[PDB]
A paper describes a structure:
The AAA+ ATPase valosin-containing protein (VCP)/p97, known as cdc48 in Saccharomyces cerevisiae, is an essential and highly conserved protein involved in numerous cellular functions, such as regulating protein homeostasis, endolysosomal trafficking, membrane remodeling, chromatin regulation, autophagy, Golgi formation, and others. Its core function is to unfold ubiquitylated proteins in an ATP dependent fashion. Previous studies have established that post-mitotic Golgi reassembly requires presence of VCP, as well as two adapter proteins, VCPIP138, and p4734,35. VCPIP1, also known as VCIP135, is part of the ovarian tumor protease (OTU) family of DUBs, an essential family of enzymes that remove ubiquitin tags from proteins to regulate protein homeostasis and function.
Interestingly, we also identified a region on VCPIP1 that engages VCP at its C-terminal domain (D2 domain), which we named “VCP interacting domain” (VCPID) after validating its functional relevance. In addition to the anticipated VCPIP1 UBX domain interaction with the VCP N-domain, we observed density corresponding to three VCPIP1 interfacing with the D2 domain dimers of VCP, which we later assigned to the VCPID domain of VCPIP1. The observed stoichiometry between VCP and the VCPID domain of VCPIP1 is 2:1 with each VCPID contacting two D2 domains (D2 chain 1 and D2 chain 2). The VCPIP1 VCPID interacts with the dimer through its alpha helices, while the β-hairpin loop connects to the VCPIP1 stalk region. Notably, VCPID Y623 makes π-π interactions with F758 from VCP D2 chain 1 and engages through insertion in a hydrophobic pocket formed by D627, K754 and T761 on the same chain. VCPID N621, D627 and K754 also interact with VCP M757, L652 and Q645, respectively. The primary contacts of VCPID with the VCP D2 chain 2 are formed through insertion of VCPID F638 into a hydrophobic pocket formed by P626, Y755, and F758. This interface is further stabilized by a salt bridge formed between VCP K754 (D2 Chain 2) and VCPID E641. The three VCPIDs interact exclusively with VCP and make no inter-domain contacts. We observed variable quality of density for the VCPIDs, more specifically the β-hairpin loops, suggesting that there is compositional and/or conformational heterogeneity in the binding region.
Numbering used by the authors:
A (entry chain F): 198 to 430, 436 to 588, 593 to 718, 724 to 774
B (entry chain H): 589 to 612, 616 to 657
C (entry chain A): 198 to 430, 436 to 588, 594 to 718, 724 to 774
């Protein structure tokens, strides 16, 4: 029972399902697969940030399928003297072959077989070649699947990614909010958590935490509770049964967290929805046609012989919900959403690291269906002045990757730019972000929806009329409405703290309760609106509306009558 | 029709002309149209004129902004 | 019968034929060769992306020719201890000598003899030197052909490419549509396939697959079908034979497949024909004269003592079919077509990788006769402002063009929307001297373009594409393709909406036909409401002025001859 199983592993349901489909048939029905005569998977390379329980996934698969599991640790193999490591590898593969079907897990593969450049000693190259020889010799070995864990696909010798070798690849990646919740539930099974804790809240608050990080967080909360109990006070269990961790402990652990994957590229289905940004019905329809249709009805496109549009380009005033729209469409199709902010493109430009663009697209290719979002495609263009041409290394690499990505994969590039003019024209050609969608300032309905979405997490007095606030906030971008909501919240918090200080001081001076401000009231929003600013002047919307009017005026040639 | 001068400098040629602006329904001036008309009138069939159009658009936008 | 043969090799019919020509007489008739004083091939070097079946090619050649096949594995040799690797190489060559005529296939040669810089340890250099010595001693060995497999020619030690060592080189490359279809037929032979599947369709879809990828795709489709049937149930044969793979399984595998050669340059005969781009009969004749004649009638050029033109430069509005014309002329002569887009030139420029230009030409040289096409020769000129007119990448292109032997039938075809900013040094004689104007398509050309675009899309007979072309005067090929795609989009949206309405009706009435089986005429009517002329009259004006300026200098027409 203590052995690992699919229940013990969480946060990678999709990848775990992929591994299941890859390895169940060759392992559950070895002789049947041999009789079929079809090539089974031979090398499965799980990669992702460390601490995501890759070895846990391998052990769970082996245990659930009953296949003999052999663990090879990269550091363990390398620690042995020259020649001894080769003997260890040969013995490991031989033992795995003996107890076929079996799984050989080479944990920390990059420790054994890094990039050829990184390897310096002769024995390092020799052991890498020994591993390659064994992988090629798997052909004569029956029902032996080799699984390897490495931080990134480019962290190991490319010779290991050939065919007959670690060809199958799986990106475990950091878990999402739902995955984090699953991990927390898995690691909080034995802990008798108090009723106060809602693991969903922490799962939302634990952004950037790998599975190991969440396990450490749960351990830290347990140790906080145990510290409190010991301070209150071979060991009886009734106290442990009665020992309950509370949201105080979990928040304290959250404070002392140090997530290990804060800088990892987040790939997940966004929680945003169309209701979060009302209106934009035409843009919603266009986004649906571009994303949902090719991913939900490939048959229609095949029947009518069209290639789905590779991407679209949003243009409009800043902070009008371009990111909101991209996330909403990604959520509509339940497609992974990858956002590349303007700082990322600028970092690639300054460091001359445009090659990283390829990685980005690879990531998206690994998460298909996906919605690749470029937050500010014009960031590089702006950084260059706003006396060369429009071409630049980073956008050129983006073009190269966009051209060279198969349309069978449902990766859709949504570009966002506040300056449609300065964007490199080469990106707007057919086969690229051909379509240009104008995201204007929110209208009254969109303003109401934005205000409602912003105030979703705030206790707001029912007296406030968000309809009125949206009504006379004409010309306010989504960012401006968010700022108004945040400032009203700030005023409410300041009033709450001031009232609490007054209450405690009164108790001090009058030793001798109720919440003075349990909700954000109308006066708070009025004071906030006394600080409201229109981040977009009439002239900027003039520019955007006029560009749209130009693109529409030339879109004439109507009046067509076929007969 | 607010008239303000703009100078087209291209191909070593300087041509200063007044742009009429219809700031005030649906007949309002459009920089992306007036600039194209200007370059066509003064530099018809001239390669690399799009950047000149962008320059004219920027200048007209700056002039119109109050 | 499982022994490999030419029947089991697909996607490299040209390269397989070349290898057969190289290695047939030396192996089939070894004693004859030893009798004659003619130098046989010694070292063949198959290079191409991994998983292309190079080892399969060598094994098939050896088996069909009957020669003794000895396989050396690079990783296997390098796995052994110092001295053991050299002993293994010596023993392999000795075995090949003993059982001659023989083929020694060194798989993953770069593993044994990578670039000399990568060889760090002394033992690695010693092994490479030992391999070189074995090659040099490969003279009195009873016609022992040694073939090696590598990724790229530069991935191995240059000393191995000297004469006597590996000298003949074959570029297996990537299978083409026909090649992919051949590979699919080879790998699906045993699998029982339902009539739903049409392998040519997937072969068209499976772009970027190398053949190992195609085998993986076929295995994935078979496993998908087996999984679908698994819940129902050493294994009984009748059920296996009954089991069939449907086109749905192949499409699912396509979706799940990860091609391993999406970066490799595509060398193949394009399927575009002159029909796909009607009209331009004058440009058609010009392209024929430049490309087809020197390859079809070398005798005439020799007799009249003319050097074939090295290349031509297309200039005109964007999206007017310059790429279409280049592909059409390549197809007519059945010559491989290499496309070098503007992003590639800009990548070489930004990264200072202009050396890669040489590689491009080398590749073009390998696939001769070839039509090397540069989609945007002005990309670098535009990126610099549109300083002098010379840049590193275009300079390297000029160097390679000068160094290109005119006997190899490699024809450069530049293309640009900004002929003015093209470096004049490339328009000199012996370079892309001739300039061809590719104007906007005319009515016949527009009709041809529309018909070509609406070839894979079922469209109603009520549509009069002739009238549509007549009304789209001034539209470029890109604009016509946009109109066709918009019409298909409207048709798809109507189909989706009708399907949703029907499903909702069933939901509210649980108690058929295609609502829109064809792209109806109203769909084109609507699409024409989202149709623009991407090339304004000013762009046409500037191109016409450029052409007129070029032609005006071309006076002296009224020449006499007393």
């Amino acid at each position: 029972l203590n052995e690992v199983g699919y229940d013990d592993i969480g946060g990678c349901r999709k990848q775990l399902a992929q591994i299941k489909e890859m390895v169940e048939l060759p392992l559950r029905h070895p002789a049947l697969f041999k009789a079929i005569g079809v090539k089974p998977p031979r090398g499965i390379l799980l990669y992702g940030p460390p601490g995501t329980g890759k070895t846990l996934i391998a052990r769970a698969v082996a245990n659930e399928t009953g296949a003999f599991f052999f663990l090879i640790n990269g550091p363990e193999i390398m620690s042995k003297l020259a020649g001894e490591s080769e003997s260890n590898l040969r013995k490991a593969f031989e033992e795995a072959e003996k107890n076929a079907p079996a799984i050989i897990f080479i944990d920390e593969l990059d420790a054994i077989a890094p990039k050829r450049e990184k390897t310096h000693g002769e024995v390092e190259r020799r052991i890498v070649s020994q591993l390659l020889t064994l992988m090629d010799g798997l052909k004569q070995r029956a029902h032996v699947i080799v699984m390897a864990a490495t931080n990134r696909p480019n962290s190991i010798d490319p010779a290991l990614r050939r065919f007959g070798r670690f060809d199958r690849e799986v990106d475990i990646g950091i878990p999402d909010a739902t995955g984090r919740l699953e991990i927390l539930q898995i690691h909080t099974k034995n802990m008798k958590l108090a009723d106060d804790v809602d693991l969903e809240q922490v799962a939302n608050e634990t952004h950037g935490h790998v599975g190991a990080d969440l396990a450490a967080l749960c351990s830290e909360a347990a140790l906080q509770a145990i510290r409190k109990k010991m301070d209150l006070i071979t060991i009886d269990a009734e106290v442990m049964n009665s020992l309950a961790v509370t949201m105080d402990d979990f928040r304290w652990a959250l404070s002392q967290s140090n997530p290990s994957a804060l800088r990892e590229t987040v790939v997940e289905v966004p929680q945003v929805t169309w209701e979060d940004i009302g209106g934009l019905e035409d843009v919603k329809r266009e986004l649906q046609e571009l994303v949902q249709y090719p991913v939900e009805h490939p048959d229609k496109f095949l029947k009518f012989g069209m290639t789905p549009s590779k991407g679209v380009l949003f243009y409009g005033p800043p902070g009008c919900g371009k990111t909101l729209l991209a996330k909403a469409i990604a959520n509509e199709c339940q497609a992974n959403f990858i956002s590349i902010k303007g700082p990322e493109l600028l970092t690639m430009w300054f460091g001359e690291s445009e090659a990283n663009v390829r990685e980005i697209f690879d990531k998206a290719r690994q998460a298909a269906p996906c919605v690749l979002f470029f937050d500010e495609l014009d960031s590089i263009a702006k950084a260059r002045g706003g006396g060369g041409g429009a071409a630049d290394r980073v956008i050129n690499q983006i073009l190269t990757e966009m051209d060279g990505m198969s349309t069978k994969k449902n990766v859709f590039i949504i570009g966002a730019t506040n300056r449609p003019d300065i964007i490199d024209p080469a990106i707007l050609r057919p086969g690229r972000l051909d379509q240009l969608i104008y995201i204007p300032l929110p209208d009254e309905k969109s303003r109401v929806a934005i205000l409602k979405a912003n105030l979703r997490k705030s206790p707001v007095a029912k007296d406030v009329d968000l309809e009125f606030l949206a009504k006379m906030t004409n010309g306010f971008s989504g960012a401006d409405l968010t700022e108004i909501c945040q400032r009203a919240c700030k005023l409410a918090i300041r009033e709450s703290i001031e009232s609490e200080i007054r209450r405690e001081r009164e108790r001090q001076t009058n030793p001798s309760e109720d919440d003075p401000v349990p909700e954000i009231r109308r006066d708070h929003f009025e004071e906030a609106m006394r600080f409201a600013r229109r981040s977009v002047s009439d002239n900027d919307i003039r520019k955007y509306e006029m560009f749209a009017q130009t693109l529409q005026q030339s879109r004439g040639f109507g009046s067509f009558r076929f007969p | 029709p607010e008239a303000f001068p703009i100078t087209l400098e291209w191909g070593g040629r300087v041509v200063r002309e007044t742009v009429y602006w219809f700031q005030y329904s649906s007949l309002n001036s459009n920089v992306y149209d007036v600039a194209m008309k200007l370059v066509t009138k003064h530099f018809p069939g001239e390669f690399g004129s799009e950047i000149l159009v962008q320059k004219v658009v920027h200048t007209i936008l700056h002039q119109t902004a109050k």
